[PDB]
Amino acid sequence: WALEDFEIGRPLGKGKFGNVYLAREKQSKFILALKVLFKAQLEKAGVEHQLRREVEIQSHLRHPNILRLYGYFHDATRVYLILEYAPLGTVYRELQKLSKFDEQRTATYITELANALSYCHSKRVIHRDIKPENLLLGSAGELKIADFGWSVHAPSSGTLDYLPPEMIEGRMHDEKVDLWSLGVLCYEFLVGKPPFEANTYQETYKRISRVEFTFPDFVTEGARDLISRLLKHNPSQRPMLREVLEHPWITANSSKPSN
Ligand SMILES: Nc1ncnc2c1ncn2[C@@H]1O[C@H](COP(=O)(O)OP(=O)(O)CP(=O)(O)O)[C@@H](O)[C@H]1O
Ligand SMILES: [Mg+2]
Numbered sequence: 001w002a003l004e005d006f007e008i009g010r011p012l013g014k015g016k017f018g019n020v021y022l023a024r025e026k027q028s029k030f031i032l033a034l035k036v037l038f039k040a041q042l043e044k045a046g047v048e049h050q051l052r053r054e055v056e057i058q059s060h061l062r063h064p065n066i067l068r069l070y071g072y073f074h075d076a077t078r079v080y081l082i083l084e085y086a087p088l089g090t091v092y093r094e095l096q097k098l099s100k101f102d103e104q105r106t107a108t109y110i111t112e113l114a115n116a117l118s119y120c121h122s123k124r125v126i127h128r129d130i131k132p133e134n135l136l137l138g139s140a141g142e143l144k145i146a147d148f149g150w151s152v153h154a155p156s157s158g159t160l161d162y163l164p165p166e167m168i169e170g171r172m173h174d175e176k177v178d179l180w181s182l183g184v185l186c187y188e189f190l191v192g193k194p195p196f197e198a199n200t201y202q203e204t205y206k207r208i209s210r211v212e213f214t215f216p217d218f219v220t221e222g223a224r225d226l227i228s229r230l231l232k233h234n235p236s237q238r239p240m241l242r243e244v245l246e247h248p249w250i251t252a253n254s255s256k257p258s259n
Pocket of ligand 2: 133
């Protein structure tokens with residue numbers, strides 16, 4: 001597997017370690033996304049081994065709400081990831097355009113997230129880096145979790161906007177990290193801002209460890225209940241994904257069934 005087997009198109013995104021390009025395999029005309037990481041940069045930090053673990057985790061995951069990793073190769077200087085192509089962009093860009101989502105879209109997206117996370121937790125997998133810019137949209141507008149560069153196994157040990165207290169406090173985290181991020185996202189979808197945003201890293205840190213946030217008036221009581229249950233300082237207090245998928249506000253507003 002070499003780069004000569006793909007025609008490269010426009011870039012789909014740019015990052016510190018590399019770039020993502022639309023691409024087509026020449027033999028079959030299969031269109032896909034090619035993520036080109038540069039070893040030099042991955043080595044400048046201690047990330048090349050986290051990349052190896054992320055690739056091994058993602059290749060064993062098959063779920064309609066998880067971006068597929070078809071394969072991977074490398075050359076002298078670059079690492080190539082062969083990714084499923086998500087043609088409708090990121091939830092982040094959708095959030096900028098629409099400013100905020102209504103209860104129906106939010107509940108649908110949370111349901112799709114909770115389904116995919118349930119499949120991951122049912123295989124001892126945490127993501128930790130669930131940001132809007134890592135949620136992609138498929139041809140039918142379905143959510144796909146991408147960017148598994150931070151996923152890990154077991155407890156284990158940028159902007160903090162989506163990280164729970166136990167992570168910023170440097171403690172040992174577990175599968176409950178994904179529950180906190182789910183509550184951050186639910187809030188951001190309805191309000192248009194993550195609930196602990198601030199002009200400063202140091203201030204954002206304080207807010208998260210205190211769980212200091214407030215709702216705009218238009219947030220309904222059902223959304224407040226779900227969000228307050230997820231954003232608990234104590235991981236063991238956060239609900240299970242089953243409790244989320246069966247939350248009243250989710251069932252009433254979600255257009256997609258649960259799992
Ligand atoms: N299969 C895919 N289909 C469509 N767009 C994609 C895509 N994969 C990535 N992108 C776009 O490129 C951006 C960055 O890709 P990705 O999040 O996977 O790498 P990354 O976050 O690790 C960047 P860095 O190397 O700096 O850490 C995404 O936010 C998205 O806009
Ligand atoms: Mg990303």
